[PDB]
Design a protein around this ligand. Structure first.
Ligand SMILES: *[C@@H]1O[C@H](CO)[C@@H](O[C@@H]2O[C@H](CO)[C@@H](O[C@@H]3O[C@H](CO[C@H]4O[C@H](CO)[C@@H](O)[C@H](O)[C@@H]4O)[C@@H](O)[C@H](O[C@H]4O[C@H](CO)[C@@H](O)[C@H](O)[C@@H]4O)[C@@H]3O)[C@H](O)[C@H]2NC(C)=O)[C@H](O)[C@H]1NC(C)=O
Ligand SMILES: *[C@@H]1O[C@H](CO)[C@@H](O[C@@H]2O[C@H](CO)[C@@H](O[C@@H]3O[C@H](CO[C@H]4O[C@H](CO)[C@@H](O)[C@H](O)[C@@H]4O)[C@@H](O)[C@H](O)[C@@H]3O)[C@H](O)[C@H]2NC(C)=O)[C@H](O)[C@H]1NC(C)=O
Ligand SMILES: *[C@@H]1O[C@H](CO)[C@@H](O[C@@H]2O[C@H](CO)[C@@H](O[C@H]3O[C@H](CO[C@H]4O[C@H](CO)[C@@H](O)[C@H](O)[C@@H]4O)[C@@H](O)[C@H](O)[C@@H]3O)[C@H](O)[C@H]2NC(C)=O)[C@H](O)[C@H]1NC(C)=O
Ligand SMILES: *[C@@H]1O[C@H](CO)[C@@H](O[C@@H]2O[C@H](CO)[C@@H](O[C@@H]3O[C@H](CO)[C@@H](O)[C@H](O)[C@@H]3O)[C@H](O)[C@H]2NC(C)=O)[C@H](O)[C@H]1NC(C)=O
Ligand SMILES: *[C@@H]1O[C@H](CO)[C@@H](O[C@@H]2O[C@H](CO)[C@@H](O)[C@H](O)[C@H]2NC(C)=O)[C@H](O)[C@H]1NC(C)=O
Ligand SMILES: *[C@@H]1O[C@H](CO)[C@@H](O[C@@H]2O[C@H](CO)[C@@H](O)[C@H](O)[C@H]2NC(C)=O)[C@H](O)[C@H]1NC(C)=O
Ligand code: 7VC
Ligand code: 7VC
Ligand code: NAG
Ligand code: NAG
Ligand code: NAG
Lengths: 743, 734
């Protein structure tokens, strides 16, 4: 049993997860087999040639974010002992210089978020084996440095370097003497205003070049931002990319470009992805000579080149967009325009592989929706943050929202269409005419108050995943949504009435109708009474998320109407009853919970009593989640009630005693979470167990606890995570120390 | 010191607050003098002869929300000065037998009283206001409220009679002539006879709302008459009702309004026609010519389902409304407002309020609001303007000012909240009248303010920009409003790690109140001080003063040093563990009210209160404070109100109060005091783990010696130990 780090196999090696544990120094108590050690986000202040002895097999060390709440003191040659160190991460360490005498065995070095202003031969030219060198975020908006200083030809000794990142350093100019081994050169936000012909010669293996943020488009810029003055674009010489014939990724976002020289791509027959966000290219989009130079371009971002002060009727799309044969995703966020017509997108209708059109946040009023029928491969039509009316961390892409436009689980069903955050206040009768066949649909957050009658979705009868979150919908008619017989997922999360006055009823009879409905989410609907039918019914449903409702009211109904609300959901395996303000559950009510359950969540309620006997009603149950409640005790023999339960989550409760033979014998239990409770100790009197969580208990650390210590040691198979936070409250002297420290 | 009731005199009388104390019976522990006894919201089950034994000097008794409640026939008879009895939410099956003739007001709301019998109330001759709403409404038991013939006819001083939320089917016969306010909402009365309201010549208010309701999109249950069928009101229904000031026909499913209804009704002042089907009537509108004295017309939510018309059709007969003060056309739902459409309201001399909330209007011809003599309130919330290039509440017409009063006070108010003004248009404000109060809240507004956006309405005194994404980095931002006094930027953040420039504040000659709550301010660029000679109030809640004051170079040690007129400052929710000792001394010495609550303070340097000779109120609630100083007098003589609840203070320094004569109100509720040892007016102790051992029944006597000092919530100052005692109130032990 390791301490303080959590140690485990990874692939074919053993790894030491030692992060966020308040260590003031590299431990010497690390396993012998460990080759990767993560000490990041700690209180480590100094590193000497002695810190990592007896650990010479180490391949990778991560020291990021040390220390927390002056920087890190790295003695010279501190690491020269480690003859196998490949990857060394020193990020956010407040380093004042490149540490000297770093092992020549290194292949990946990261020194981002430090105060390093000199890049010297001393520091890193002995490191002939570097593949990946990351020096970013060192001089930006800081009294010093004035300017990062790059000793002429530091690199070039680096004949194996493939990745170099100098982004976010005041460089003013591209370093000369860069190795020809480079494939990826990151120079975002480096105050490089001009790109000579000479600057990138000899880099005939370049696959990626990042020059974003040079001559920022500073307008409404979240971070500080010093534009070039004259509002001038970066200045790239004509033939400046002529011997870059491998370039696959070019990121010119936020370089104040008005004009794009088609010369730049003359020798770039493979350009795959072009970032042009945060520029002034409305003009160039209208004409665009350069579009003829990019028959292999797969991803084009022209987002956020709107013209301040302006809100034009139509978008202007060059004919040349049709020369983009290989285009897969066109990102046209925040161009800002009112009407979009069939004819405006004629160019894109020919592109065979175009599957994503992103028209996010253009505040568009009218769209000619039939136009999307005319595309062989549209999979994702993303129209969030428009005005359609009813119809009668420095390791993140800084500029292009890379996470999915639409929830995988929704898009997985087919063509997706996102109309969230528009003006669709009711669903017009022509709302969805001329749409192609949509499988996934977002109407979230449209202040939408439709009285659903069963005819609103007839034009797209095959929607499978429907997101209606954050509207004001009325599904009192039991025909509601019936035209969607293939619907599999429904999200009514956060749905209320338009008045947001307390006292709203709900009819849930529409649910029973669906023969393959699988997931329904009524979270935060504030349901306290159903009208007429007091049972939900489904032969298909598998998941109901009922959180943020008033089951506390429903089950305390003195006349007993909701004793079986859920029983008729006959296939249900997962039920989330969290946040329902539950003090206790009528025994009768709990025994009507569908016997089919596998996972039950009653966490974050106010339960003070739980009838462990009732788990006999539930032969298939595996996960029971009673976290964040007010429970005082546990039944002294669980086995007798269930032989199915795998995981029991009790954390954030008021349990001070473990019953005798509680764990002897739970039998089928693997994960037990008794963390943040009121245990002071554990009897030896209290198995197939494999996680036991205990951090956050006010443990009395005397000789009484010694029982448990030797139970732990004689049960290494049972993981107990997070030891650091298994804290003695008493008796300080002991207080604050980990219960693994005593004798 | 009355227990358990808190007692205090108001005018000649004397009140005994006695609610929310978990009482199971009527204390015989009651001040003999008490004339008003409030017992509501408790755990009471029985009322007897000698539940009020020697209390003949009682005048009002409230027993609402208890615990059903059981009352002995004649339980109240003894009390010959009993005027007002309130018995709501009591689960009563019948009207208590034998009630004092003396009653002028009775209330039996939210009970199960299905029969109104002479036996019950025919003796109560002096009744003026009788409330019986919500007894027979959607519970299978009681199909119908049974009302004895002429039961109310002996009540011949009866002014107000409410029976709303009861199935009656028809207006009861034999009502007394002295009725002035008859409330019959939600009663299932689809027909009004001529005889129903015969001769009620003192009526000023009639409520028929909710009979044959517009059930479509109704929050609570709802059942229309058969078909979309309207209430049926006989042509003569209202013929002898000349006094009527108030008529509520909300949600009666009206398509047609018979102008004859108003023939004999020249003084009608307020008329509710909300939630009906009168798009037609609004276009034609005969009834409109019969309403010369009407002041508040409400036509809200008459929208036709499925429809979204370009225009609104106002009949020209809208000009026959010469007394009009407020028109409420919410939820009509239309797309364009042309100058011509509101011709009929333009010379109505006293029209001060137009409310067009929730119409989803895309375009308005704004110059038209210039053709109005007395507009004060133009309410356009929840439309689509683009950038230009409880029983006793009102079910339907909601009452709560349309615009914060504080804003409206300044002059003409324009609320364009919840529209689509995603930036500020070059011509957004051209051809508006002279606006004093503007609400731009929640338009997803990303304007980079440059100092010229507002110059067509430069006389804005109160500007509300909350819930947008404004960029005010430029030092000229908003300066064009040199008369600006209130600025609200609550919840403003970038549309995507964002820094702030605040220089713009200094330029204002007359700015009173600045609100920056929830701006996640962690850094200022260039200038590190806020500066103003006018600012009285700053709200800096929900920002990163923890980061700013833990700067290495100490840039922000004088962030507010230069708000030299500052009286009120709010540093709540800033994640403060620790305020650097001299940063605290650089807060305006002008300060009167300093709020540092809902942070994480471990320590507080009580000495530094010397530098603040004006401080009346200090608020440190919701922190982790361990200690109070013993010598608070040395450090201030100004402080009146100190608030410490929700801290970890287990010790009260001896003679802490003695002598901080200045202190009037001291809140130590929800702290760790186990006890209290050896000129104040309130002291809050509840929520403390008191030890109820014999030592420190000192404090118990210290309470007796000082009756002047008020302790609220006494039933909740609760022994934790040794217990046994655990759960008992401190007051009870011996
Ligand atoms: C309304 O209610 C629904 C139903 O709950 C919510 O939608 C579900 O949301 C949950 C998360 O809240 C989703 O669960 C997550 O799925 C992710 C996708 O998993 C991939 O890989 C797994 C491997 O097993 C596959 O099963 C799956 O097909 C995918 O290929 C996972 O990333 C998530 O894993 C979580 O657990 C592990 C720990 O075990 C963590 O390491 C992860 O970080 C993570 O937290 C998780 O399982 C679920 O898939 C959604 N379902 C549907 C149908 O949409 C909605 O969110 C809710 N709506 C609103 C508004 O709240
Ligand atoms: C941003 O900060 C603003 C300034 O703090 C917030 O506005 C303030 O809101 C408080 C309450 O949150 C108001 O105080 C209330 O005012 C009413 C009315 O007071 C006036 O009239 C009464 C008689 O009716 C009289 O007694 C007073 O003397 C007043 O003249 C009080 O009745 C309440 O008890 C309470 O004090 C401030 O008045 C108000 N200031 C302004 C300038 O509006 C604002 O809400 C904040 N924004 C957000 C989003 O939170
Ligand atoms: C149909 O429209 C009717 C208007 O014709 C509505 O009648 C109004 O009913 C409301 C809600 O029950 C009632 O509530 C208010 O009155 C109580 C008494 O007023 C006191 O306080 C005020 C304020 O300071 C003062 O001006 C008064 O003199 C008095 O002292 C208040 O306790 C309560 O908080 C509330 O303000 C209205 O007074 C009543 N209007 C009249 C003129 O009687 C009716 O509600 C509506 N029906 C439905 C179902 O919506
Ligand atoms: C400008 O655009 C380029 C692409 O043209 C962006 O390059 C990408 O940068 C992101 C963020 O670092 C990289 O993602 C990372 O990948 C690695 C390795 O698989 C992983 O460790 C990280 O978790 C993350 O997934 C991405 O690889 C890199 N793209 C390529 C093709 O190398 C660049 O960030 C843009 N510049 C700015 C300032 O936004
Ligand atoms: C439908 O649109 C809404 C709004 O765009 C999406 O909501 C976002 O969801 C993610 C993950 O659930 C959150 O982190 C964001 O904060 C949400 N944004 C907002 C503005 O609320 C929603 O996920 C979309 N639905 C689908 C199925 O993709
Ligand atoms: C501007 O418009 C907003 C939106 O209607 C108003 O916001 C309300 O503020 C009050 C507090 O005064 C809250 O109780 C409500 O919840 C808010 N309503 C909404 C819909 O958010 C705001 O009051 C208006 N500003 C002024 C100055 O009148
Ligand atoms: C003077 O400052 C501005 C600021 C913002 C805009 C915008 C704008 C607004 C909100 C948005 O979400 C997007 C993408 C753009 C459009 C036009 N003109 C402006 C002028
Ligand atoms: C069949 O269901 C509906 C539901 C709602 C409407 C609405 C509507 C929506 C939301 C609102 O706030 C207002 C005031 C009206 C307008 C038209 N036709 C409808 C049809
Ligand atoms: C489109 O995608 C397919 C399969 O991924 C690929 O074979 C084809 O080359 C692509 N089309 C073009 C024009 O590049
Ligand atoms: C119930 O759902 C499970 C998947 O959760 C599935 O294996 C089973 O076939 C379903 N049975 C019915 C009747 O829906
Ligand atoms: C400072 O505040 C006081 C009280 O509101 C006021 O009388 C005075 O005019 C203000 N000072 C300035 C310079 O505006």
């Amino acid at each position: 049993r390791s301490y303080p780090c959590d140690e485990k196999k990874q692939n074919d090696s053993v790894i030491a997860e030692c992060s966020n544990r308040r260590l003031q120094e590299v431990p010497q108590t690390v396993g012998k087999y460990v080759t990767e050690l993560d000490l990041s986000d700690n209180f480590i202040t100094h590193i000497t040639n002695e810190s990592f002895q007896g650990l010479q097999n180490l391949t990778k060390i991560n020291l990021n974010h040390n220390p927390n709440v002056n920087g890190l003191n790295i003695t010279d040659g501190a690491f020269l002992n480690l003859k196998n160190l490949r990857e060394l991460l020193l990020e956010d360490n407040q380093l004042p210089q490149i540490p000297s005498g770093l092992p020549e065995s290194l292949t990946e070095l990261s020194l981002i978020q430090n105060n390093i202003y000199n890049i010297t031969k001393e520091g890193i030219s002995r490191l002939i084996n570097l593949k990946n060198l990351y020096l970013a975020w060192n001089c930006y908006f800081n009294k010093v440095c004035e300017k990062t200083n790059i000793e002429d030809g530091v690199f070039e000794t680096l004949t194996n370097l493939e990745l170099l990142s100098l982004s976010f350093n005041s460089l003013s100019h591209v370093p000369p003497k860069l190795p020809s081994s480079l494939r990826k050169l990151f120079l975002s936000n480096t105050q490089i205003k001009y790109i000579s012909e000479e600057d990138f010669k000899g880099l005939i293996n370049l696959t990626l070049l990042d020059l974003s943020g040079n001559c920022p488009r500073c307008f409404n810029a979240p971070f500080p931002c010093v534009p070039c003055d004259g509002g001038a674009s970066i200045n790239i010489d004509r033939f400046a990319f002529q011997n870059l014939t491998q370039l696959r990724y070019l990121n010119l976002s936020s370089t104040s470009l008005r004009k794009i020289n088609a010369a730049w791509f003359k020798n770039m027959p493979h350009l795959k992805v072009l970032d042009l966000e945060f520029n002034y290219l409305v003009g160039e989009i209208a004409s665009g000579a350069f579009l003829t130079m990019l028959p292999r371009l797969e991803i084009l971002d022209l987002s956020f080149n709107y013209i301040k002060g302006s809100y034009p009727q139509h978008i202007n799309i060059s004919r040349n967009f049709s020369k983009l044969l290989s285009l897969r995703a066109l990102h046209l966020r925040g161009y800002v325009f009112q009407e979009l017509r069939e004819d405006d997108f004629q160019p894109l209708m020919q592109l065979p592989n175009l599957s994503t059109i992103n028209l996010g946040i253009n505040f568009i009023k009218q769209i000619d929706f039939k136009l999307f029928q005319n595309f062989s491969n549209l999979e994702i039509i993303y129209l969030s943050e428009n005005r359609i009316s009813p119809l009668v961390d420095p390791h993140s892409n800084f500029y292009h929202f890379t996470r999915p436009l639409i929830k995988p689980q929704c898009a997985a069903y087919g063509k997706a269409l996102d109309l969230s955050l528009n003006s669709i206040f009711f669903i017009g009768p022509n709302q969805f005419e001329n749409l192609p066949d949509i499988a996934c649909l977002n109407l979230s957050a449209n202040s939408n108050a439709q009285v659903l009658s069963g005819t609103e979705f007839s034009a797209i009868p095959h929607v499978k995943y429907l997101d209606l979150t954050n509207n004001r919908l009325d599904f009192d008619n039991a025909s509601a949504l019936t035209e969607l017989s293939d619907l599999e997922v429904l999200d009514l999360s956060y749905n209320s009435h338009y008045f947001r006055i307390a006292g709203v009823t709900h009819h849930l009879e529409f649910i029973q109708n669906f023969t393959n409905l699988k997931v329904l989410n009524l979270s935060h609907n504030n349901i306290y009474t159903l009208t007429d039918k007091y049972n939900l019914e489904s032969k298909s449903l598998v998941e109901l998320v009922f959180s943020g409702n008033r089951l506390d009211i429903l089950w305390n109904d003195d006349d007993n109407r909701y004793i079986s609300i859920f029983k008729g959901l006959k296939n249900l395996t997962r039920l989330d009853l969290s946040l329902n303000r539950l003090k206790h559950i009528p025994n009768e009510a709990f025994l009507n919970l569908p016997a089919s359950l596998t996972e039950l969540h009653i966490n974050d309620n106010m339960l003070k009593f739980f009838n462990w006997t009732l788990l006999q009603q539930f032969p298939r149950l595996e996960l029971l989640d009673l976290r964040g409640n007010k429970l005082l005790f546990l039944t002294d023999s669980l086995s007798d009630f269930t032989s199915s339960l795998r995981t029991l989550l009790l954390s954030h409760n008021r349990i001070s005693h473990l019953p005798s033979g509680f764990l002897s014998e739970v039998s089928s239990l693997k994960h037990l979470d008794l963390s943040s409770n009121l245990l002071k100790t554990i009897n030896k009197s209290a198995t197939k167990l494999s996680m036991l969580e205990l951090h956050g208990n006010p443990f009395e650390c005397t000789c009484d606890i010694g029982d448990f210590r030797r139970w732990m040691d004689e049960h290494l198979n049972v993981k107990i995570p997070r030891l650091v936070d298994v804290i003695c409250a008493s008796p300080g002297d002991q207080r604050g120390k980990s219960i693994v420290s005593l004798e």
